[PDB]
Amino acid sequence: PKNFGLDVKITGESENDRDLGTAPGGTLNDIGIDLRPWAFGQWGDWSAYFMGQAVAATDTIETDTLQSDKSYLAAREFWVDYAGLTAYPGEHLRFGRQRLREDSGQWQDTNIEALNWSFETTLLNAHAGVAQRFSEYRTDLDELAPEDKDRTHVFGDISTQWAPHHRIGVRIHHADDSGHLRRPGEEVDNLDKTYTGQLTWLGIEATGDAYNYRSSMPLNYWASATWLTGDRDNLTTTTVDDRRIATGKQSGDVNAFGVDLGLRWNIDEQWKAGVGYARGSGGGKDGEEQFQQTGLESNRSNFTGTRSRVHRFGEAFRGELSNLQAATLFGSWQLREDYDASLVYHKFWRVDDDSDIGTSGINAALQPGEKDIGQELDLVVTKYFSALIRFRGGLFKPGDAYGPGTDSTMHRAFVDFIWRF
Numbered sequence: 001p002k003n004f005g006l007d008v009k010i011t012g013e014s015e016n017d018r019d020l021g022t023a024p025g026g027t028l029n030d031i032g033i034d035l036r037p038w039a040f041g042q043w044g045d046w047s048a049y050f051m052g053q054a055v056a057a058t059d060t061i062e063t064d065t066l067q068s069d070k071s072y073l074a075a076r077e078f079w080v081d082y083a084g085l086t087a088y089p090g091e092h093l094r095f096g097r098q099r100l101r102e103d104s105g106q107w108q109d110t111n112i113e114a115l116n117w118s119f120e121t122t123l124l125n126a127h128a129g130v131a132q133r134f135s136e137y138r139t140d141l142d143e144l145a146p147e148d149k150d151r152t153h154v155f156g157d158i159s160t161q162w163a164p165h166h167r168i169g170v171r172i173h174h175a176d177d178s179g180h181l182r183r184p185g186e187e188v189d190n191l192d193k194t195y196t197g198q199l200t201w202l203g204i205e206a207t208g209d210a211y212n213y214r215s216s217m218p219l220n221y222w223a224s225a226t227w228l229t230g231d232r233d234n235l236t237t238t239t240v241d242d243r244r245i246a247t248g249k250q251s252g253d254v255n256a257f258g259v260d261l262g263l264r265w266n267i268d269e270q271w272k273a274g275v276g277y278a279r280g281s282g283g284g285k286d287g288e289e290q291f292q293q294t295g296l297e298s299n300r301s302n303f304t305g306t307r308s309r310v311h312r313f314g315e316a317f318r319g320e321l322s323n324l325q326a327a328t329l330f331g332s333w334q335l336r337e338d339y340d341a342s343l344v345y346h347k348f349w350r351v352d353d354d355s356d357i358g359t360s361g362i363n364a365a366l367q368p369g370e371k372d373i374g375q376e377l378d379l380v381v382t383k384y385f386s387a388l389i390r391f392r393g394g395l396f397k398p399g400d401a402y403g404p405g406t407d408s409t410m411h412r413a414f415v416d417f418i419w420r421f
């Protein structure tokens, strides 16, 4: 067994106005290094792992693709795994700050303090667990983000392969927030809570080699349908002197719906192309029909049919399933294990033109009555040597919901050199 290693990364991020030229900041044209040494131990049914992180950048640039000062030191992963409960080789119980992942990247793709149980067999896959955030384990952050404070996650899943390469399964996730929203006229932070309450996500999903870059099948697919219920309290905010002020709350219950469908043509072993459609419900009375995600998602997957993970709702726009409709068109190319290139086009709309949307990457006010968010074109190019050189850039063109006063175009482009030891 290999007890230790080191991962070296050099990232160059160029971000134009993320607020679309409407607020100070939102520009990053800086470089940085990210060093991740790790340790591993194995003694029969028992396992233990650790991963550190040391970052030195010329500005606060993104070096982690997963959901989350210039220099910092942190504890990324620390767990103890037990594999002696059953005779099954793919069954283990993991406890500690670990990486919860799911193939679609839409339910969970993060590093969180959790007690997780995995049961993986030939015809059946089942998982269950609990997760809560108690710290950032970072040197530059002493206080835990109020957003992630007192939010308990209870999740489960069960899948079956009804036909070879064809899977059907159900998922459940409960978020029990026992915290409190800001009182009126308070300084609402950038890391502050948007909601409190009890929420139950119930979903059904069907895939046919949806995230497999090496498939024998001529056509690939994914079909997802999620329902959301429970009691939710949303915090209402106002602008004032560019310092967001809390202006009350809206307490009710939720009855929202989320959908994600897609199809991929495998022309040959190198060339692939496909289409996608996603809908996250919006509006209703007191935001009752407004859909949202668990808050553990990254929205990143191998939906283009390559080894490289691409953002499902744009690298620039970085949308999420909340009052949002999306139309996607893509193309792929891959030379064995030497290269991979992806080209992705997206068109975004609003489900309700009076309500707010789900987005990162963009921090600009939406004008009422206008449904057209905008369009995007993504490019991803990877060269492999352990070591790799990647370019991942997105060019977003704002629509009528942003109106005049906004720049004609917006971009976010990264370069990653990852050499591993």
Ligand SMILES: CCCCCCC/C=C\CCCCCC(=O)OC[C@@H](O)CO
Pocket: 003, 039, 040, 041, 042, 048, 049, 050, 078, 079, 080, 095, 096, 097
């Ligand atoms: C619930 C959170 C617990 C945190 C787990 C801590 C794990 C930290 C480091 C893992 C590496 C352990 C290496 C030391 C060890 O005891 O094994 C001896 C090893 O050298 C022989 O294989």
Ligand SMILES: CCCCCCCCCCCC[N+](C)(C)[O-]
Pocket: 004, 005, 006, 037, 038, 421
């Ligand atoms: C300050 C923390 C640094 C921890 C160092 C991690 C070990 C690096 C080992 C990589 C190079 C040697 N090798 C080839 C034997 O692996």
Ligand SMILES: CCCCCCCCCCCC[N+](C)(C)[O-]
Pocket: 014, 016, 029, 393, 413
């Ligand atoms: C394949 C062509 C990719 C070119 C990269 C995109 C252009 C961004 C230019 C980087 C400098 C950023 N700045 C400061 C001019 O905005």
Ligand SMILES: CCCCCCCCCCCC[N+](C)(C)[O-]
Pocket: 012, 013, 014, 029, 030, 031, 058, 413, 414, 415
């Ligand atoms: C071949 C063009 C690729 C696009 C450039 C990627 C962004 C790198 C910009 C970092 C500039 C660092 N600087 C100026 C702070 O020293």
Ligand SMILES: CCCCCCCCCCCC[N+](C)(C)[O-]
Pocket: 052, 053, 054, 073, 074, 075, 135, 136, 137, 138, 139, 141, 142, 143
């Ligand atoms: C390279 C790994 C070294 C870890 C350095 C991180 C230590 C800072 C985090 C301290 C724990 C957080 N808190 C809030 C509970 O104090």
Ligand SMILES: [Ca+2]
Pocket: 017, 018, 019, 020, 021, 022, 023, 024, 025, 026, 027
């Ligand atoms: Ca700005």
Ligand code: NA
Pocket: 083, 084, 085, 086, 087, 088, 089, 090, 091, 092
């Ligand atoms: Na086992």
Ligand code: NA
Pocket: 212, 213, 214, 215, 220, 266, 305, 306
């Ligand atoms: Na494929």
